[PDB]
């Protein structure tokens, strides 16, 4: 008569590593690194991504007329910007604090485009266009958000000024530019005055600009340049503008609700998906159950920490050693 104490063995082929042994067979394990991903850009808690295939973020903000992009009023949780997108600032020149501007547009809990000025009311000729900024239909055009003012015909450009009061439900992003013609003849034909002062001011902003005449290298047909700028008009504040030439004046601003978090994905080949996820990595969506993931170091949402390991198997059962 005999009684024996024992433990279970099974047909598991699982192994784990321990601090003192490699590849120990065990009766059951569980994986701690999430390695499976849905290779697409999905909705998150904040909603749907905005895809930019042909336009850079700057182009849609300033409203490059080749940029059809529909920004919807629901807003967007993040921006997928294809690196191959050709259209940027159609009239050559660069945006001051460009990375910060892209940052403020990367998320929006909702979106509203606001008219700041009507240049009917101004003693200038309005809505100049350029072959550098062709519309998608074909003719020459200009940015939608800023308005190219030149001298009232036949030859007058006095100081013009106007004011906009932010009575809206948020902070407004507004945009402007300053044209630097390539020579004094072009300066006088466009603006009459050989030198001009353009001021953009708010309750807190105090900025002034004068043109620097001269030829720059040819870019997209142009030896002139624009410097582009942007600002934030807080609730209740006043935006005043004043110019006797060279100001590319603010016409449409943007009311974005929510804070921004720099959610910009610079990716060519992963598509927009029809899917929802708690965790969106830059390489695809993943479950967030496990404590680690090896999809990507960049991610949004409620995400496990990134590790560059193929697996981290935790022993659950026994050392698998049959009799």
């Amino acid at each position: 008569d005999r009684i024996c104490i024992g433990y279970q063995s099974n047909n598991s082929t699982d192994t784990v590593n321990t601090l003192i042994e490699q590849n120990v067979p065990v009766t059951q394990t569980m994986e701690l690194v999430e390695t499976e991903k849905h290779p697409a850009y999905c909705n998150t808690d904040l909603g749907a991504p905005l895809e930019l295939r042909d336009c850079k973020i700057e182009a849609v903000i300033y409203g490059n007329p080749k940029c059809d992009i529909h920004l919807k009023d629901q807003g967007w949780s993040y921006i997928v910007e294809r690196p191959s997108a050709p259209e940027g600032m159609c009239y050559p020149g660069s945006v001051e604090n460009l990375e910060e501007l892209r940052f403020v547009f990367s998320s929006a809990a909702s979106y509203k485009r606001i008219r700041l000025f009507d240049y009917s009311r101004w003693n200038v000729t309005r809505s100049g266009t350029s072959k550098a900024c062709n519309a998608s239909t074909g003719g020459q055009s200009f940015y939608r958000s800023i308005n190219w003012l030149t001298k009232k015909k036949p030859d007058t450009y006095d100081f013009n000024e106007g004011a906009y009061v932010n009575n809206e439900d948020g902070d407004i992003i507004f945009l402007w530019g300053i044209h630097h013609p390539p020579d004094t003849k072009e300066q006088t034909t466009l603006y009459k005055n050989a030198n001009t002062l353009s001021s953009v001011t708010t309750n807190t902003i105090n900025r002034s600009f004068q043109p620097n005449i001269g030829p720059r290298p040819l870019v997209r047909g142009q030896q002139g340049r624009m410097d582009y700028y942007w600002g934030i008009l807080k609730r209740g504040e006043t935006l005043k503008i004043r110019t006797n030439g060279n100001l590319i004046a603010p016409e449409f601003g943007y009311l974005l609700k929510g804070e921004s978090y720099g959610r910009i994905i610079q990716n060519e080949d992963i598509p927009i998906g029809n899917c929802n996820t708690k965790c969106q990595t830059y390489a695809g969506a993943i479950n967030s159950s496990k404590p680690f993931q090896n999809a990507s170091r960049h991610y949004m949402g409620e995400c496990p920490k990134y590790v560059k390991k193929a697996s981290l198997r935790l022993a659950v059962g026994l050392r698998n050693t049959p009799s």
Partner: protein
């Protein structure tokens, strides 16, 4: 029949640890549900602590820098690189450490069950062998089932005393 010293049992399908007895009525193999449940609860806790104490609150976007912001670009990358080295090392070492402890915990649970039965049997059995007691008396399937559920006394004290001098 042998116990745990000579390896694991593929027969046992209802638990991690248990009992194999042989008397004249034949043999019985059953899991000890009480020592199995304890171990399962413990390993469940361990797994839940490792998985659930991790925070899934903070986001890591890819920030953009101008060509005259090289220094802050590198500082940003340094945060990501050094934090990642910390997680990579601690997560590997945690799993290696805990995997070693889990397999030792199983071995120790088995030996705890063995020692719980040697204390109930006392002088009525020779502890000799291989995770196995040789019982010195009449112990049928209802005596067996009392060695397993714990409700077993030293009734048999001198039936074995005779069997032990032989």
């Amino acid at each position: 029949i042998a116990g745990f010293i000579e390896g694991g049992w593929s027969g046992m399908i209802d638990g991690w640890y248990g009992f194999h007895h042989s008397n004249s009525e034949g043999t019985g193999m059953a899991a000890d549900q009480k020592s199995t449940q304890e171990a399962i609860d413990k390993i469940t806790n361990k797994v839940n602590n490792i998985v659930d104490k991790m925070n899934r609150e903070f986001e890591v976007v890819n920030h953009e820098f101008s060509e005259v912001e090289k220094r802050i670009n590198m500082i940003n990358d340094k945060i990501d690189d050094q934090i990642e080295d910390l997680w990579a090392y601690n997560a590997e070492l945690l799993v290696l450490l805990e995997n070693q402890k889990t397999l030792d915990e199983h071995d120790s649970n088995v030996k705890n069950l063995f020692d719980e039965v040697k204390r109930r049997l006392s002088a009525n059995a020779i502890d000799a062998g291989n995770g196995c007691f040789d019982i010195l008396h009449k112990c049928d399937n209802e005596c067996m089932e009392t060695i397993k559920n714990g409700t077993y006394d030293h009734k048999e004290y001198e039936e074995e005393a005779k069997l032990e001098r032989s």
